[PDB]
C-alpha cells in the first residue's frame, strides 16, 4: 500500500503548488479539496484511519465549506488583483521561494540522518483513540471545548451584520 | 493516568474559571447586564486566587501526562489571575462608553486567564500548544473587540495572521521533535540521546519551536507584530497581552527548558544567546524615536522579555534564575499594570470608532497628578532604577547573567538599559510639561485604587523586598 | 581649538551611533503583513541554520 | 495489509466499486454531450454565522465521535468528563440562542 | 515497509510551499488558505510521527491541530468579511495605517 501513499503524495503536492499559483480562488479551494483528500489518502495508506475520516469529515468537510461560504458570499471572484498578476512575476517570485526553498533545503538535511525502522501496518483504530482521548488527555477535550467556544463567541462578535435582510450592498463603513 | 479525587483540589483554579466561564455565559443568555457579568468575573477570579490558597494547603502533584501542579505553577497562576482582575477593572470603565456588546470580552478575558493558567500548569506538549492557543483565541477577539476602528481591526488581522503562522511553526517543530523522540512530555524529549544529544531532527524542532514561541514573547527577528498589536488594541487589552499572555508563556518556555535534557545543549543556548542580546538591543534601539506611548510600551516588552531570556540562558548553571525570573516578573508585571492602567483609565470610556485613541501624555500632571504620579512611577520601574522592584528584578538578571560569565550579555543589559532610560525618563518627565489643550464613577475610582495599590506595591518591594524574595523561593518546582 | 569640546563629541558619539541605528532599524517597522510574514519565514532559516552550523 | 486474501478482495472490490461508479458518471456524461445533434453587493452575515456554527459544533462532534468508541473500556470519569463537555456544550448552544444568533426572522 | 523521512519530507513540502503562498500572495483569504496548508502540513507530520511509534498521541495531536484550524480558521473568515465590509477590498498591503 506504499504506491497509494507515494501516489497520494505526489499528488498532494502537485495540487497545493496549483492551489498557490492560480488566479480564481474558486478553482484553488477546489484543488485544495483535492489536496485535502490526497493527505487524507496518505493518513489511510499509514494506518490512520481515524485522521484521514477526521480530514474528509472536517478539513475537507467543514473548513472549505466555510471558505466557499465566504466566496461565494461577498461575492470575490479575485478581482482588482487578477488584473495585477503580480505573483506571476520574477521580482515577487523569485525571493520568497528561494527563502522557502533554502528552509526546506535545511530542513530536509535535518529529515535525513535520522533513524528509520519504517511505517509499518497495524493501523490505529478510533477506539484507541478515544481510549486515548478520554484517558490521559481529559484537561485536552475541556479545554479544546473552551477552545472552540473562544473561537465561536469571536467570530459571532465580529462576524455579525447588525442590517438586515438577505442581500445588502457594499456601502463604505456600514453608513 | 486515570484522575484521583484528591487531584481534584489541584486542579481547583482551572476548574474555578471554567465554571465561572460558563455562568458568565448563562448570565449574559439570561438578563444581558453588564455590571452583573463583571461582577461575576470578578468574583470568580478571587475565589480562583481563594481556591488557589487551598491548592498551597495541598502538595505539588503530577495529575495526568498533561499537568503537574507546583509552586512554579502556583505563582504564575496567581499572576495570570491578578494580571485578569487588573484587566477586567480596566476595562470596565472603557466598556461603560461601547455600543455594542459589552460582555463578550469579560467571558474571553476569563477564557484567556483560563489558558494561562493551563500554561503556568503545562507539563507536556500539547497542554502547551493548547495553553497558547487558548492565549491567543480570546486575543484575537479582545485586540478586535472595537473592530468598528480602523486600527483595532489592522491589529487584529496582523496579530491573527502572524499568530496562526507561529502556531503553525511550532506545531511542526512539537511534530518534528515527536518523529525524533517518541514522547510529548518535557522531561522524555531527549532521554533516548546520551555525547548524541545535538540531534539534527531534534535541533530543527526545537528551533520551530523557538521560532513560534519568540513569536509570542516578541523576540527578534519575530517581534514586528508587536508595536502595532500594542498600539491598535484598546488599552486593557495592551495591558492583558502585556502582562498575562507573556507571563504564562514565557513560565512555560522556562518549564520546557528546564524538564526537558535539551536545555544542556549548547547549541540551543548559542542561538537564544543571540536572539536576546540582538533582542534587547533591537528593542531598546527602536524605542528610542518613539512619541507613542503603546508603541513604545510594546519595544519595551521586546526588552524586557530580552532580559526574560538572558536570564533564562543561566538556567542549567545559577540555580537560582528561576527565582530571578520570578521577581522580576513579579515587577515586570505590577510596572505594566501600573503603566497600563494609567493609559486606560486616561482612554476611558471608547468615545466611538472616530475619536482619536491618542494617549497625549504630555501635560497629564496638571488634571490628574495621581496617574501621573502612578505613571512616572511605572516609568522608573520599568527603567531599571532603585527604589522599585524593576530594579530588583534588573538586579538579579545581572547576578544570573555574571553568574554564568555571560559576559556579552551582561554587556548588552547594561548598554541597552542605558539606552532604554533616555526614552523612559523622557516620557517620565515629559508627563510633567504644559500641555497645549485638553471621571467620577466608583469604578474608575477602582482602577485608580488598582494603580494606586500597584505604585504602592513597586515602591515597597523596591525598598523592602525580601518578603517577594521569601514567596518566590517558597514556590520551587520539582527539580 | 577647543572652544567646542572634542572629547564630548567622542563621547557622544555613541549617542549619534545609537540614533543613526534606531533610524535604520525603524525601516523594518514599515506596517506590512506581507513584510511580518517574510521576516519570520527569514528568522526561521536562521535559526535553522545556526543550529545546523553549530 | 496485503495478504490475508479476503480482505484484499474486500479492497478490490471497494476500489473497484469506486473507479466504475466514477467511470459510468463519466460515461453518462460523455453519452450526453456526444449524442442528440447540435444546432457591488453581498449575501449577508448569517450564512457565515450558521456555517461557522457547523464547523464549531462539528468539531466539538468529532470529539464525541471518538467517545463513542470508547464510551465502555472507559469508566464513569469517561462519562463525568463527557457530561461537562456536552454541559459547556450545551451552554454555548442555549447562549446562541438566547442572544438570537441561531434564528432567522425573515 | 514506508521510510519516515519520505514522509516527514512530504510534510516539509506542504508546510514549504504554504510558506510560500502566505508569503507571495496579496489576497488575504489566499493568505488563510496557505495558513491552512501550513497546518495541514504540520498536524500530516504529527499524524506520520505517531504513526512511526505505533501510539496514538499523534492523532490526539492532530485533533487538537484540527480544532486549532477551524476556530481560527472561523476567526480569519469573519476578520475577512469585516475587512470587506469597512474597506471594500481584501488587499492586505491597503491596511497598513500603523507604521514604525
Known amino acids: 500500500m506504499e504506491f497509494a501513499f507515494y501516489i497520494c503524495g505526489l499528488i498532494a503536492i502537485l495540487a497545493t503548488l496549483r492551489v498557490i499559483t492560480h488566479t480564481n480562488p474558486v478553482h484553488a479551494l477546489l484543488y485544495l479539496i483535492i489536496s485535502l483528500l490526497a493527505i487524507s489518502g496518505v493518513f489511510f495508506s499509514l494506518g490512520a484511519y481515524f485522521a484521514g475520516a477526521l480530514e474528509i469529515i472536517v478539513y475537507a468537510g467543514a473548513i472549505m465549506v466555510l471558505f466557499v461560504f465566504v466566496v461565494m458570499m461577498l461575492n470575490l471572484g479575485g478581482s482588482e488583483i487578477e488584473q495585477e498578476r503580480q505573483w506571476l512575476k520574477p521580482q515577487v517570485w523569485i525571493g520568497p521561494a528561494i527563502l522557502s526553498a533554502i528552509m526546506l533545503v535545511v530542513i530536509v538535511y535535518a529529515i535525513l540522518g535520522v533513524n528509520d525502522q519504517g511505517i509499518d501496518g497495524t493501523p490505529i483504530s478510533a477506539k484507541a483513540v478515544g481510549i486515548t482521548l478520554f484517558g490521559p488527555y481529559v484537561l485536552a477535550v475541556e479545554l479544546a471545548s473552551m477552545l472552540l467556544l473562544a473561537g465561536l463567541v469571536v467570530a459571532f462578535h465580529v462576524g455579525r451584520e447588525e442590517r438586515a435582510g438577505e442581500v445588502l450592498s457594499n456601502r463604505k463603513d456600514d453608513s | 493516568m486515570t484522575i484521583t479525587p484528591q487531584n481534584l483540589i489541584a486542579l481547583l483554579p482551572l476548574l474555578i474559571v471554567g465554571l465561572t466561564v460558563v455562568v458568565v455565559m448563562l448570565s449574559i443568555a439570561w438578563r444581558r447586564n453588564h455590571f452583573l457579568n463583571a461582577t461575576l468575573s470578578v468574583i470568580g477570579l478571587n475565589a480562583a486566587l481563594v481556591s488557589l490558597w487551598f491548592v498551597g494547603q495541598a502538595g505539588a502533584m503530577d495529575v495526568t501526562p498533561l499537568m503537574r501542579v507546583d509552586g512554579f505553577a502556583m505563582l504564575y497562576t496567581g499572576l495570570v489571575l491578578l494580571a485578569s482582575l487588573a484587566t477586567c477593572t480596566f476595562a470596565y470603565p472603557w466598556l461603560e462608553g461601547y455600543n455594542d456588546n459589552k460582555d463578550e470580552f469579560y467571558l474571553l478575558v476569563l477564557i484567556a486567564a483560563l489558558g494561562g493558567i493551563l500554561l503556568a500548569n503545562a507539563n507536556h506538549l500539547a497542554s502547551l500548544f493548547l495553553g497558547i492557543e487558548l492565549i491567543s483565541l480570546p486575543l484575537f477577539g479582545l485586540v478586535g473587540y472595537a473592530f468598528r476602528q480602523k486600527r483595532s481591526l489592522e491589529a487584529s488581522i496582523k496579530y491573527t495572521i502572524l499568530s496562526a503562522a507561529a502556531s503553525s511553526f511550532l506545531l511542526f517543530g512539537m511534530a518534528l521533535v515527536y518523529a525524533q523522540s517518541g514522547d510529548l512530555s518535557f522531561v522524555a524529549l531527549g532521554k533516548n540521546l546520551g555525547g548524541m544529544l545535538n540531534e539534527p531532527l531534534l535541533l530543527a524542532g526545537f528551533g520551530l519551536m523557538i521560532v513560534g514561541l519568540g513569536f509570542k514573547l516578541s523576540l527578534v527577528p519575530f517581534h514586528l507584530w508587536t508595536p502595532d498589536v500594542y498600539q491598535g488594541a484598546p488599552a486593557p487589552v495592551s495591558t492583558f497581552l502585556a502582562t498575562a499572555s507573556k507571563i504564562a508563556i514565557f513560565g512555560v518556555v522556562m518549564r520546557l527548558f528546564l524538564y526537558a535534557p535539551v536545555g544542556d545543549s549548547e547549541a540551543i543556548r548559542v542561538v537564544l544567546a543571540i536572539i536576546a542580546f540582538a533582542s534587547i538591543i533591537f528593542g531598546n534601539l527602536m524605542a528610542l524615536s518613539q512619541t507613542n506611548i503603546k508603541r513604545l510600551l510594546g519595544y519595551s516588552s521586546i526588552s524586557h522579555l530580552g532580559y526574560l531570556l538572558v536570564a533564562l540562558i543561566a538556567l542549567q548553571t545559577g540555580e537560582m534564575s528561576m527565582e530571578a525570573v520570578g521577581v522580576y516578573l513579579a515587577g515586570y508585571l505590577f510596572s505594566s499594570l501600573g503603566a497600563f492602567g494609567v493609559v486606560s483609565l486616561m482612554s476611558s470610556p471608547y468615545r466611538g470608532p472616530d475619536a482619536d485613541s491618542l494617549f497625549s501624555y504630555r501635560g497629564l500632571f496638571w488634571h490628574r497628578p495621581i496617574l501621573a504620579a502612578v505613571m512616572t512611577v511605572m516609568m522608573l520601574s520599568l527603567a531599571g532604577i532603585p527604589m522599585t522592584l524593576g530594579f530588583i528584578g534588573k538586579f538579579y538578571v545581572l547576578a544570573v547573567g555574571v553568574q554564568a560569565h555571560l559576559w556579552w550579555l551582561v554587556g548588552a543589559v547594561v548598554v541597552g538599559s542605558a539606552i532604554g532610560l533616555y526614552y523612559y525618563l523622557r516620557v517620565a518627565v515629559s508627563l510633567y510639561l504644559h500641555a497645549p489643550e485638553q471621571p467620577s464613577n466608583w469604578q474608575y475610582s477602582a482602577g485608580g485604587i488598582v494603580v494606586l495599590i500597584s505604585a504602592l506595591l513597586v515602591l515597597v518591594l523596591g525598598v523592602w523586598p525580601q518578603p517577594l524574595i521569601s514567596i518566590v523561593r517558597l514556590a520551587m518546582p520539582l527539580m | 581649538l577647543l572652544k567646542r569640546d572634542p572629547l564630548n563629541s567622542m563621547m557622544n558619539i555613541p549617542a549619534v551611533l545609537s540614533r543613526f541605528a534606531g533610524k535604520g532599524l525603524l525601516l523594518s517597522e514599515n506596517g506590512y503583513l506581507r513584510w511580518y510574514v517574510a521576516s519570520m519565514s527569514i528568522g526561521a532559516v536562521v535559526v535553522l541554520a545556526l543550529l545546523m552550523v553549530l | ?106 | 515497509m514506508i521510510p519516515l523521512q519520505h514522509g516527514l519530507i512530504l510534510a516539509a513540502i506542504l508546510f514549504v510551499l504554504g510558506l510560500t503562498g502566505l508569503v507571495i500572495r496579496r489576497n488575504l483569504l489566499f493568505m488563510l488558505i496557505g495558513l491552512e496548508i501550513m497546518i495541514n502540513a504540520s498536524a500530516l507530520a504529527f499524524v506520520v510521527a505517531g504513526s512511526y511509534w505505533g501510539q496514538t498521541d499523534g492523532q490526539v495531536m492532530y485533533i487538537l491541530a484540527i480544532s486549532l484550524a477551524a476556530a481560527e480558521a472561523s476567526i480569519g473568515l469573519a476578520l475577512l468579511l469585516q475587512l470587506h465590509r469597512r474597506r471594500q477590498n481584501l488587499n492586505i498591503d491597503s491596511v497598513s495605517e500603523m507604521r514604525g
Not at chain 4, 7 to 34: K, N, R, S, T
Not at chain 4, 52 to 58: E, K, R, S, T
Not at chain 4, 76 to 105: C, K, N, Q, S
Open chain 4, 1 to 106: 495489509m496485503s495478504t490475508s486474501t479476503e480482505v484484499i478482495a474486500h479492497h478490490w472490490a471497494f476500489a473497484i466499486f469506486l473507479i466504475v461508479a466514477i467511470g459510468l458518471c463519466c460515461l453518462m456524461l460523455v453519452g450526453g454531450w456526444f449524442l442528440g445533434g447540435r444546432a457591488r453587493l453581498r449575501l449577508s452575515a448569517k450564512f457565515y454565522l450558521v456555517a461557522m456554527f457547523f464547523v464549531i459544533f462539528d468539531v466539538e462532534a468529532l470529539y464525541l465521535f471518538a467517545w463513542s468508541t470508547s464510551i465502555r473500556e472507559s469508566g464513569w470519569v469517561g462519562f463525568v468528563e463527557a457530561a461537562i463537555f456536552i454541559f459547556v456544550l450545551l451552554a454555548g448552544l442555549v447562549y446562541l440562542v438566547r442572544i438570537g444568533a441561531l434564528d432567522w426572522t425573515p
